[PDB]
Amino acid sequence: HMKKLLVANRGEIAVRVFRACNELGLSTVAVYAREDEYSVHRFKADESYLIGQGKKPIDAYLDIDDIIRVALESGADAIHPGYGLLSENLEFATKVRAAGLVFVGPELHHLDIFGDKIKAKAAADEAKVPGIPGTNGAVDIDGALEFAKTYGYPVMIKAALGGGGRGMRVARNDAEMHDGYARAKSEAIGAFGSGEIYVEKYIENPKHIEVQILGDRHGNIIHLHERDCSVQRRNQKVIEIAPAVGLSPDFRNEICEAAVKLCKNVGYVNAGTVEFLVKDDKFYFIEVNPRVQVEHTITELITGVDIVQAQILIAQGKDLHREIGLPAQSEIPLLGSAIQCRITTEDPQNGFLPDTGKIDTYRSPGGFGIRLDVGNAYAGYEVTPYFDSLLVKVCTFANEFSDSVRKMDRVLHEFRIRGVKTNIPFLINVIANENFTSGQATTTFIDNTPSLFNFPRLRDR
């Protein structure tokens, strides 16, 4: 029935959905701002229409009514939002489904439940998936100390500020509880005059584990194993590997089963990611991303399952096993390991500020075990400051994690992007580290390894 699909996004994810639609025999429609007129994704579609005229380009890509008008005028039957712009916007999906179009994503109840921290926590508690294990809703200093007694140490507080502000207090010594709560409440009453006091069990050096979930409208929910997104610079993802080679396979299966149980309890449809924090055989639920992730490519590599094609086919209403052809959960293969590096314009010698300018040289590696998902990184492209810093996603996969590391080193040295500074020396330093190659990297690994910032002098004749 569905014949034409509009992508309400830009960059590499728009090209990825375009490739999936062309492989599924669907016509493609692109949208682009005036400042994004030289984007690759504009010319990779059958139709391209300017949206958000007279607006800021990132506001143009958030224009719900303009995108819906373009989809209606072009005859598009479906809208794929990609990620990061309107993929989790409840109003956009509501208006798209009210216009008669197909929103390639989860249902509206999933979108508002996982777009709200309280609702997501309530769903996780209903599905018996443990979060960060404290009596957080208790508001008392005596409540805080008894909370410290019943589960344990350390304890990190939210007495400083309500929304988006954390106390972040290190509590180890038994007297440090008492005087730290004293100073924390003394600072808390003077802070803003009004707020909310929350308690939280602090997790020291956790592992960020995400489980990829696919679900159709018929009720079949499968997981596509997990990814390790622990390599993070200031709570921002740098390198994601799949599967979590550091963790034992039975523990990874347990985490994936917990994610499957949660998504089956909420009745999840289409693609989604369940995030976790992992520490010494304990895992804690954090969030559900109700959209396709940037690092879905390594899951595709290690499972052999086209996630975007499955997204479109589930949006068509097809069964996960009968019509799409995905096997049962026990028959989902683990084809090996895979590493994703996001090459951006962030200059690591300049405090990871996104560089701008014209790319004069672009050479892309290839060969065995290499996957490329390029954005706008061609030679002669002018890097605008409006959009994301990402140039190209490079994915290396092999039967063994060590060969994936070796191939990633080969392609990071082979990659030649000139005219703008890239994070390639930082990525080389990270994959050269013995913690990452062993797979024992945690979320605090980047900030606690200053040797990653010693970049050698490049001659550049």
Ligand X SMILES: CC(=O)SCCNC(=O)CCNC(=O)[C@H](O)C(C)(C)COP(=O)(O)OP(=O)(O)OC[C@H]1O[C@@H](n2cnc3c(N)ncnc32)[C@H](O)[C@@H]1OP(=O)(O)O
98 vs 458 by CB, closer to ligand X: 458
R_g (Cα) of the chain, nearest Å? 23
Note whether 344 and 316 are within 8 A (CB). no
175 binds ligand X (CB under 6 A): no
Q: Return the range that interacts with ligand X (CB under 6 A); candidates 42-50, 199-207, 335-343, 452-460.
A: 452-460
Report in angstroms the alpha-carbon separations of 336 from 78, 149, 412, 434.
Answer: 34, 43, 21, 20
Task: Report the residue from 142, 174, 434, 460 that binds ligand X according to the rule CB under 6 A.
Answer: 460
414 binds ligand X (CB under 6 A): yes
Task: Report the residue from 43, 279, 416, 438 that binds ligand X according to the rule CB under 6 A.
Answer: 416
Note whether 303 and 225 are within 8 A (CB). yes
413 binds ligand X (CB under 6 A): yes
Q: Return the range that interacts with ligand X (CB under 6 A); candidates 158-166, 253-261, 327-335, 412-420.
A: 412-420
Peptide bond into 154 cis (omega under 30): yes
Note whether 112 and 290 are within 8 A (CB). no
Beta strands in 198-345 (DSSP E): 199-201, 207-215, 221-232, 237-242, 270-279, 282-289, 337-344
> Cα–Cα distance between 317 and 67 in angstroms, integer?
23
> Cα–Cα distance between 363 and 150 in angstroms, integer?
57
458 binds ligand X (CB under 6 A): yes
406 binds ligand X (CB under 6 A): no
Binding-site size, ligand X (CB under 6 A): 10
434 binds ligand X (CB under 6 A): no
> Cα–Cα distance between 253 and 260 in angstroms, integer?
10
Task: Report the residue from 166, 410, 433, 437 that binds ligand X according to the rule CB under 6 A.
Answer: 410
- One of 121, 201, 207, 237 is an active-site residue; which one? 237
Site residues (CB under 6 A) for ligand X, limited to 350-389: 361
35 vs 414 by CB, closer to ligand X: 414
4 vs 418 by CB, closer to ligand X: 418
Tokens 């004069």: give the residue. 360
349 binds ligand X (CB under 6 A): no
Active-site annotation holds for 318 = no
The contact set with ligand X (CB under 6 A) reads 361, 410, 413-414, 416, 418, 458-461
Residues that are catalytic: 237
